[PDB]
Write a protein that binds this ligand. Sequence first.
Ligand code: HEM
Ligand code: HEM
Ligand SMILES: Nc1ccc2ccc(CNCCCc3cccnc3)cc2n1
Ligand SMILES: Nc1ccc2ccc(CNCCCc3cccnc3)cc2n1
Ligand SMILES: C[C@H](O)[C@H](O)[C@H]1CNc2nc(N)[nH]c(=O)c2N1
Ligand SMILES: C[C@H](O)[C@H](O)[C@H]1CNc2nc(N)[nH]c(=O)c2N1
Ligand SMILES: [Cl-]
Ligand SMILES: [Cl-]
Lengths: 362, 362
Amino acid sequence: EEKEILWNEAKAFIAACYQELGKAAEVKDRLADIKSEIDLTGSYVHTKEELEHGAKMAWRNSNRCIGRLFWNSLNVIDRRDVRTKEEVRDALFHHIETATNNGKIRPTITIFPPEEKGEKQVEIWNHQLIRYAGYESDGERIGDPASCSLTAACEELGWRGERTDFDLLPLIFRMKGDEQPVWYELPRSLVIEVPITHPDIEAFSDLELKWYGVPIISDMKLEVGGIHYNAAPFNGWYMGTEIGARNLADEKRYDKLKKVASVIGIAADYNTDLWKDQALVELNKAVLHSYKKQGVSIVDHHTAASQFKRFEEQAEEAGRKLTGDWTWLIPPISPAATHIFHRSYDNSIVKPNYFYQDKPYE
Amino acid sequence: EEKEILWNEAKAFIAACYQELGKAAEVKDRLADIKSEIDLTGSYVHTKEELEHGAKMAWRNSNRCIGRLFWNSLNVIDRRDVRTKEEVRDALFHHIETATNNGKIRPTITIFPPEEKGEKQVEIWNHQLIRYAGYESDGERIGDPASCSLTAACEELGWRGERTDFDLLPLIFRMKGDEQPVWYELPRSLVIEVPITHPDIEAFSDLELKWYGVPIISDMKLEVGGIHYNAAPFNGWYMGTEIGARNLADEKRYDKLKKVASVIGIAADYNTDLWKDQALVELNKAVLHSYKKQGVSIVDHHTAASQFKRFEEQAEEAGRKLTGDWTWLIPPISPAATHIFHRSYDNSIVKPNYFYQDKPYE
Ligand code: HEM
Ligand code: HEM
Ligand SMILES: Nc1ccc2ccc(CNCCCc3cccnc3)cc2n1
Ligand SMILES: Nc1ccc2ccc(CNCCCc3cccnc3)cc2n1
Ligand SMILES: C[C@H](O)[C@H](O)[C@H]1CNc2nc(N)[nH]c(=O)c2N1
Ligand SMILES: C[C@H](O)[C@H](O)[C@H]1CNc2nc(N)[nH]c(=O)c2N1
Ligand SMILES: [Cl-]
Ligand SMILES: [Cl-]
């Protein structure tokens, strides 16, 4: 059964991938090799080219991503050879290092061994490789509430944060065979952080806000041709709204808008004064300014929307069907000022793709 | 066939309406009367109570409306007795007058005779009873582009606008029997307009912006118990975003953001400066301030979202199933600062309701 489902998904993928690669004649003698290897071993092993392209095809089919224009420039690191947790850790250290690239962020993905027969070889617990801790205990709310569950889990394993609002969580992953995950504190030298300042409001630094340079998502399942790479951390760069309008703005996150309104000198008393809307703008201007000022990659929601329109045009030009999630594609500030708002998208799921998976903690 | 569809819809409605009215025992001797009247006449006639409540039930089931909290305070004017176009016109004049209420807007709906056997008795061409004209001719873009089609149609019938950016369109409707619609110029005394000013930027008046006080939608089909009131203009008050973020902001409408950015003293050169977002806020602050300053009803998107949450709570409290359109319920500015963004809604269509219908023009 599980041998059949793999064969069907692989037939669809290899045909399409080789179709796009210009190896349409190589499809047949490859499917045979797979047809045998599947029957004999239970699974098949991707070539370096299929996997590189499969990871690019998966980003392209991410209905919720606004930055899909550059799907083909994705730097794919093939780490299916890792066996030890010192290799996993070093590869994760290297990913941070090479994806960061001194501030000029390279969209990168590191691919670890996939599930054999549903069995994970490596199991990453981090949502993102770089992420702040969160603490909730008796009136105490410190750090990122979104990180509360993982933080408690890490503290169950011997780790202790300094309990600042910006404690770097450790890397925490579990190898096949071991009962508990291991954890490694992140070298500070490898992590770029950006202090949030404002172009013309010098009082803005009094908020002492900051965020990390590179968002490296590490808890999603890359699925390529019936093969489940449950451990494949990828990254791009930030769209400013993710930080300025959600991470630092949400009440169930950092909840900084009243503080922003105070330092930008406006009152937070009346809804009719639109202080939340005004604070959201100056904070988001601050995030973009701070990242540019340091030399770290970032895009604003308008430029990103322009780029995504090109992706729509590129897709149409290629005879490729477009898929997208409107509810996720629209930016959380001024969405009506983007073309995304004024058209619809087909939220159908095409593989290869990236999927959510259950947390090993909680 | 058309006799059956009416009977099914009526059975569902009468049962439910009387259920809510506390006349659950009166359901049976009423359905009989309908069962006969349908068989003998092809249709049935609503009582003054069912229609009043049916129009309130229809507003409640509008998945896209954020102001549904006050569905029960809807003022229903029963004008199913109109036979002449001087009665239709006067009723429309009266609707404007009583709904406006010197600035303290009453949510009102005027109900005209419904379709007999698919045949319209009255056919209103106006999108809204009060709306500005739009002109596009050889580089000329004057007024509201959204009104271009209707405006041209009105000018085909002897009407001529002064070709300002804010020409009041005439009322234009067609009576059963007549080939062409008639038109009547609106008495200026009945129309409240609001000049857009800014609380602290005196240069804002240089834009010479204004909008009308009351949005009275007149091209939607009210459906109550298999009965199609194709002519039932209704109104509430404006949520500020409709004017400040869409009507006056969209490029395919009034397209005023660069002009707003100029008068509020910021540059419109870089996306990273978030000038569209900043202009959208000050313009929207201007709209709310201008309406309050004059004494015309208006609500901001935050207060409206708070009210809609109460509607959600009121519905849950009543054992009533909630339906809603997330893509339309979220406001076009700072939507993530509202609870609407962070939950989902069932976009199922429940009757009674309001529906789009084909334009007699274009
Ligand atoms: C190049 C820079 C990129 C930008 C600016 C970008 C932008 C975004 C944004 C803003 C989101 C919404 C996230 C949220 O609201 O929480 C998103 C979602 C997503 N992006 Fe991208 N993205 C980029 C690169 C990538 C890359 C390299 C991949 C993977 C190969 C990817 C795959 C996805 C996926 C899977 C989601 C959905 C995540 C979810 O379900 O929460 N994107 N993208
Ligand atoms: C009390 C004040 C009201 C407010 C503030 C309000 C707010 C809104 C808003 C903002 C929209 C979205 C319109 C758009 O984006 O174009 C909307 C849609 C709608 N509202 Fe309301 N509304 C109110 C009263 C009413 C009333 C009295 C009715 C009818 C009885 C109604 C029925 C609807 C319907 C049918 C739509 C959907 C129209 C469409 O499909 O374009 N609302 N409402
Ligand atoms: N710039 C980018 C690129 C890719 C991204 C991929 C994923 C995400 C976030 N997805 C998970 C959101 C769910 C969540 C998790 C924790 C706290 N709140 C919400 C962002 C990306 N950004
Ligand atoms: N405050 C309110 C209350 C009720 C409303 C009902 C309808 C509308 C607008 N619906 C039609 C939008 C489609 C359109 C038409 C012309 C130009 N652009 C878009 C607003 C309401 N507002
Ligand atoms: C209910 C809704 O799907 C949910 O709140 C979504 C809305 N759209 C979103 N869009 C983005 N980019 N990110 C999000 O977290 C969400 N949340
Ligand atoms: C494609 C999408 O449905 C369309 O652009 C909608 C989005 N949500 C909206 N929401 C409101 N309130 N008004 C609108 O006109 C629209 N337009
Ligand atoms: Cl993030
Ligand atoms: Cl309107």
